[PDB]
Amino acid sequence: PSEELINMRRYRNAARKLIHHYSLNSTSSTEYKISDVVMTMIFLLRSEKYHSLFKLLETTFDDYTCRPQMTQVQTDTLLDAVRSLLEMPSTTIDLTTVDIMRSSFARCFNSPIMRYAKIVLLQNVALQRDKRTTLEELLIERGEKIQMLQPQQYINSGTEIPFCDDAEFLNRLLKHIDPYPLSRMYYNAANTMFYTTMENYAVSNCKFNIEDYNNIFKVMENIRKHSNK
Amino acid sequence: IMRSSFARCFNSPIMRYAKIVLLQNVALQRDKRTTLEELLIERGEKIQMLQ
Amino acid sequence: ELINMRRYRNAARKLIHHYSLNSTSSTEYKISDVVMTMIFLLRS
Amino acid sequence: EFTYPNLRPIACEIPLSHFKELVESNDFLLCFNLETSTMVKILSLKRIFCIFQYRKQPARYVINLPHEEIDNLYNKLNWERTRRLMKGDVPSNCATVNRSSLKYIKQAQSLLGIPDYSQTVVDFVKMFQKIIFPYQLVPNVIIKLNNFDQMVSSAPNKAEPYKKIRLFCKNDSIAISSSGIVPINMPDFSPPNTFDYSDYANRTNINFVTQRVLTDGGFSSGITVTPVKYNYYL
Amino acid sequence: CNKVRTVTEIVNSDEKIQKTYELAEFDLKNLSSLESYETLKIKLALSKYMAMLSTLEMTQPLLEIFRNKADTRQIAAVVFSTLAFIHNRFHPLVTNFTNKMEFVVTETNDTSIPGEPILFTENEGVLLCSVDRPSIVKMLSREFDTEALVNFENDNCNVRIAKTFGADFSITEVEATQYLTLLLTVEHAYLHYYIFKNYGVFEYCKSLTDHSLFTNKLRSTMSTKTSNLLLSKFKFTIEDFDK
């Protein structure tokens, strides 16, 4: 009958939504409820399972940038429990994402501000380096070793094009495909690629990622003016 | 009193992330307009439909 | 156990006194301390 | 039965219309009219099977029907035969699952060499019989049998793998379960045992080994492992 | 004001009648007729591409392919066919080009690269290309997607309300949705590839620092047919940059 006993299902699902958001960056939502955050915490405390994660997060409460020392076996159990709680199909969730999530809360608590915060702190301070480098240097250093690497296949590379001609088959396919609001849907994939733009790196990540990324779409204005000469 | 104060406290959106508003018109009369001549070039397909 | 009863009670008492009396928003207070407040209540 | 897709057209109801033809030939086509009472269908089929069992050679059924309801009626026949056996002669009567089994065995033959696409199942059955005892363990064929029947099996009807086979042979002091050797007349596995003590099958150890293996193999995906477990005997 | 007016008149001024109308809502019908069949065309194209992929002995779902790393052959073939499709869609004409091309998988982070997951080395003696299988697998880790959504609309009575009143491999759609990812990726690569194949390397100092003005070079370059920017309002919040 306790205050804990009310809705473990609610607490679980809400917490999972929040966590899946912060980690996989999955999907648009009005993802927020302070009370549900607290529910998440207490849902951790109510299991000895995930106690480790709770303790980790608690370390954040003093906001300081430091990354905690690994203890290998316990970190492995950490990964285990994390994947279990996410119920993801063996999706190779990893220490990097772990740390990012960790730092997520030490970002959030910084604000005592309650009205609202559009702020999207895309960057993470704590990424285990003295100072962010440029990109160009990285480009050099990578390309160097890159040229070393030997080819991995032989394209026969002669005259080849594939096609198929079963018009009725293709139209059957079309009708199978018909219902889906692809227009609405594919925005998700576009956002996926965007988030991937930052997932790319956790190592002196490119500070600027903005205006050129918009010029990508301004290519649309370029195209429209090309069409209209 | 502080009950109601907590009620006002706990609505406080946080930590949102990038989202996009791709929906709107692209074109209008402020764009190239189809011509009956090229529509003739199209419809001439009926001179193969025939039968 | 992990719980610093000392600092938890300290911050909770201070925050509750302040906020309950003032009945108004205060930018001073990290929400963390609210979290600690409910934790303390659930323990005690 | 046999199915090719010469034939004797046998009227699907009248017994003596083809009398003595059922003595002479072995290749019997069958039919039915749309209105027929299922009871009448069962009755006629029973009569045909009795007279065939009196016949001196295994003639071949062929039937021109959608046959899904015929598999249903076969299940009915199973009930019927059990009903008889409540008072019966305990005949070694032959019977078979007719679709799931069927296709499976067809695939089996196809993957093997097919000297006779018409070869009877019992052929393969006995062929494995030749070798079971020397290896004292259960063929996967027989295991999939009593697995993929709707009812007399692991039974997707009710999801009942619990029907594990205890298999015994003359003079044995022991039996072969679905799950290895067992001592006689006992419930398939002791709740106590020389248990799979977690100092083996420690997650940690498993994980480490797995990492080793994946590293060495250069394999990104598709590997899972599980420690073995033991019943009465080791 | 476009409040079109109209008149009939009998011979010899026997009678004259007037009426009026508006070109409004005609525009709405035109817009609907456009967008409908345009979307149809795009969907059709996608379908064609997917069907073309379907020929390639798909004993496995796509996801499996990249989730494995042991193979390279299937991956290379997929990449190649994608390039071919793009090229043809720009060039309604069959092509086979420099008959020597090869790929290498950037199997490790230390070989990884910011942004562009694909890199053409246009001629190290001959063309070569790079593939980040680990990332591609990240992208295809998917689950970002669920169709249950809501979308921008405004001023519906004028703008949208009219739109209220109009209308084995048996695989589901989510995977197909995922394909669009690599479609866009290979497109973005094709841009740079085409450019440099038509011009020098040094402009990489610009384009690959920031693609940006490259559209200026693309002026007069596009074949008078668009690609894959229908919902042209792709944008996010900007002023928040707080530089």
CA A50 from chain center: how many Å?
A: 22
- Report the 10 Å Cβ neighbour count for D49: 13
Nearest CA in chain E to B27: E31
Spatial contact of A49 and A37, defined as CB atoms under 8 Å apart? no
- Range list of H helices, E164-208: 174-198, 204-207
Q: In what order do the strands lie in the sheet containing D8-9?
A: D8-9, D27-30, D60-63
B10, B19, B20 ranked by CB distance to A35: nearest: B10
Q: Alpha carbon of A169 to those of A165, D7, D142, E47: distances in Å?
A: 9, 38, 41, 11
- Report the 10 Å Cβ neighbour count for A160: 12
The letter for the amino acid at D218 is: G
CA–CA separation, B9 vs A223, rounded Å?
A: 49
C3 to chain B, minimum CA–CA distance in Å? Answer: 24
E51, E236, E241 ranked by CB distance to A173: nearest: E51
Spatial contact of A189 and E180, defined as CB atoms under 8 Å apart? yes
Total residue count of chain B as it appears in this document: 51
**How does C5-44 read in b/e, with b if 16+ C-beta sit within 10 Å?**
eeebeebbeebeeebeeeeeeeeebbbbbbbbbbbbeeee
Q: Which residues of B touch C20 (CB under 8 A)?
A: 1-2, 5
- Report the 10 Å Cβ neighbour count for B40: 9
Q: Which residues of E touch B17 (CB under 8 A)?
A: none
Beta partners for residue E19, in sequence order: E6
Which residues 6+ apart lie within 8 Å of E229 measured at CB?
A217, A219, A220, A223
CA–CA separation, E137 vs E66, rounded Å?
A: 6
CA–CA separation, E38 vs A212, rounded Å?
A: 28
Listed by the residue before each break, gaps in chain A with C–N over 2.5 Å are none
Beta partners for residue E8, in sequence order: E17
B34 interface with E at CB cutoff 8 Å: no
In the block, residue with structure tokens 């003596």: D16
Q: Alpha carbon of D23 to those of C17, D10, D30, D51, D164: distances in Å?
A: 105, 12, 16, 9, 43
Which secondary-structure segment (H or E) carries D216?
A: helix D203-217
- Report the 10 Å Cβ neighbour count for D81: 13
In the block, residue with structure tokens 């070039």: B41
Spatial contact of E91 and E194, defined as CB atoms under 8 Å apart? no
User: Helices E73-90 and E26-54: crossing angle, nearest 10°?
Assistant: 140
Is A22 exposed, middle or buried (CB count within 10 Å of its CB: 0-12, 13-18, 19+)? Answer: buried
CA–CA separation, C1 vs A63, rounded Å?
A: 21
Q: Do D219 and E67 touch (CB under 8 A)?
A: no
CA–CA separation, D152 vs D154, rounded Å?
A: 7
Beta partners for residue D63, in sequence order: D30
Spatial contact of D189 and D162, defined as CB atoms under 8 Å apart? no
Beta partners for residue D28, in sequence order: D8, D61
Work out whether the CA dihedral D112, D113, D115, D116 comes out positive or negative: positive
Q: Do D203 and A73 touch (CB under 8 A)?
A: no
Which secondary-structure segment (H or E) carries E5?
A: strand E5-9
A46 to chain C, minimum CA–CA distance in Å? Answer: 11
Query: Does C have 3 or more CB contacts under 8 Å with D?
Result: no
Specify the 3-state DSSP secondary structure of A61.
Answer: helix
CA–CA separation, B20 vs A56, rounded Å?
A: 34
Structure-token pair, residue D195:
């248990």
Structure-token pair, residue A168:
């009725």
Specify the 3-state DSSP secondary structure of A42.
Answer: helix
Among D162, D186, D169, D167, smallest CA distance to D177 is for: D167
Q: Which residues of A touch C (CB under 8 A)?
A: 3-4, 34, 37-38, 41-42, 45, 54-55, 58, 61, 63, 109-114
Which secondary-structure segment (H or E) carries E18?
A: strand E16-20
Among E111, E112, E80, smallest CA distance to E97 is for: E80
CA E126 from chain center: how many Å?
A: 29
A 117-136: CB under 8 A from E: 118-120, 135-136
In the block, residue with structure tokens 């398939």: D188
CA A133 from chain center: how many Å?
A: 23
C17 to chain B, minimum CA–CA distance in Å? Answer: 11
Q: Which residues of C touch B1 (CB under 8 A)?
A: 20, 23
User: Helices A8-24 and A72-86: crossing angle, nearest 10°?
Assistant: 110
B26 interface with E at CB cutoff 8 Å: yes
User: Count of alpha carbons within 13 Å of B39, Cβ hemisphere only?
Assistant: 4
B9, B15, B31 ranked by CB distance to A108: nearest: B15
- Range list of H helices, chain A: 8-24, 34-45, 51-59, 72-86, 95-108, 135-148, 167-177, 182-199, 211-227
- Report the 10 Å Cβ neighbour count for E141: 20
In the block, residue with structure tokens 């050679």: D57
Q: Alpha carbon of E31 to those of B5, E107, E121, E159, E169: distances in Å?
A: 51, 48, 44, 11, 36
Beta partners for residue E224, in sequence order: none
CA–CA separation, D15 vs D20, rounded Å?
A: 10
Query: Does E have 3 or more CB contacts under 8 Å with B?
Result: yes
The letter for the amino acid at D19 is: F
Q: Do E67 and D218 touch (CB under 8 A)?
A: no
Q: Do D207 and A76 touch (CB under 8 A)?
A: yes
Spatial contact of E106 and E112, defined as CB atoms under 8 Å apart? yes
Q: In what order do the strands lie in the sheet containing E118-121?
A: E102-105, E128-131, E118-121
Angle at the Cα of A181 (from A176 to A186), degrees rounded to 5? 110
The letter for the amino acid at E92 is: P
Q: What DSSP letter does each residue of D140-186 carry, written as one string?
A: HHHHHTTTSSSSSSS-TTTT-TT-PPEE--TT-SEEEETTEEEESSS
In the block, residue with structure tokens 């007719």: D98
Is B51 exposed, middle or buried (CB count within 10 Å of its CB: 0-12, 13-18, 19+)? Answer: exposed
Q: Do A3 and C31 touch (CB under 8 A)?
A: no
Spatial contact of B5 and A27, defined as CB atoms under 8 Å apart? no
CA–CA separation, A126 vs A106, rounded Å?
A: 10
Which secondary-structure segment (H or E) carries D63?
A: strand D60-63
Among E183, E193, E206, E203, smallest CA distance to E120 is for: E193
Dihedral, A188, A189, A195, A198 alpha carbons, nearest 10: -170
Q: Which residues of C touch A (CB under 8 A)?
A: 2, 25-32, 34-36, 38-39, 42
Spatial contact of D122 and D96, defined as CB atoms under 8 Å apart? no
Structure-token pair, residue E69:
């790393």
Which secondary-structure segment (H or E) carries E216?
A: helix E214-218
Spatial contact of A86 and A16, defined as CB atoms under 8 Å apart? yes
* DSSP summary character for residue A68: P
Beta partners for residue E103, in sequence order: E129
Q: Which residues of B touch A107 (CB under 8 A)?
A: 15
Q: Which residues of E touch A152 (CB under 8 A)?
A: 72, 76, 102-105
CA–CA separation, D3 vs D137, rounded Å?
A: 34
Is E118 exposed, middle or buried (CB count within 10 Å of its CB: 0-12, 13-18, 19+)? Answer: buried
A210 interface with E at CB cutoff 8 Å: yes
C28, C29, C32 ranked by CB distance to A61: nearest: C32
Structure-token pair, residue C38:
């409910």
Structure-token pair, residue E194:
């085409």
Q: Which residues of A touch D207 (CB under 8 A)?
A: 76
* DSSP summary character for residue D16: G
Spatial contact of D133 and D172, defined as CB atoms under 8 Å apart? no
Which secondary-structure segment (H or E) carries E76?
A: helix E73-90
Beta partners for residue D180, in sequence order: D177
Work out whether the CA dihedral A144, A150, A155, A157 comes out positive or negative: positive
Spatial contact of E128 and E153, defined as CB atoms under 8 Å apart? no
In the block, residue with structure tokens 């993929």: D148
Nearest CA in chain B to E230: B26
Spatial contact of A222 and E219, defined as CB atoms under 8 Å apart? yes
E94 to chain A, minimum CA–CA distance in Å? Answer: 8
Specify the 3-state DSSP secondary structure of E208.
Answer: coil
Q: Read off φ and ψ for residue E173, nearest 5 degrees.
A: -90, -30
Chains touching chain C through at least 3 C-beta pairs below 8 angstroms are A, B
* DSSP summary character for residue B10: T
Among A26, A24, A89, smallest CA distance to E146 is for: A26
Which residues 6+ apart lie within 8 Å of E21 measured at CB?
E3, E4, E6
Which residues 6+ apart lie within 8 Å of D87 measured at CB?
none
D214 to chain E, minimum CA–CA distance in Å? Answer: 11
CA–CA separation, D99 vs D104, rounded Å?
A: 8
CA–CA separation, A113 vs A97, rounded Å?
A: 27
CA–CA separation, E236 vs A224, rounded Å?
A: 21
User: Count of alpha carbons within 13 Å of D22, Cβ hemisphere only?
Assistant: 21
Query: Does B have 3 or more CB contacts under 8 Å with D?
Result: no
The letter for the amino acid at A166 is: D
Which residues 6+ apart lie within 8 Å of A110 measured at CB?
A63, C30
CA–CA separation, A207 vs A209, rounded Å?
A: 6
CA–CA separation, D105 vs A107, rounded Å?
A: 62
Pairing of strands D60-63, E118-121: unpaired
Which residues 6+ apart lie within 8 Å of C38 measured at CB?
A38, A42
Structure-token pair, residue A171:
């139209």
Structure-token pair, residue A203:
């190592």
Among D200, D193, D198, smallest CA distance to D179 is for: D193
Q: Do E76 and A135 touch (CB under 8 A)?
A: no
Which secondary-structure segment (H or E) carries E17?
A: strand E16-20
Q: Do E31 and B24 touch (CB under 8 A)?
A: no
Among E205, E208, E181, smallest CA distance to E192 is for: E208
Q: What DSSP letter does each residue of E115-134 carry, written as one string?
A: S-SEEEE--SSS-EEEE-HH
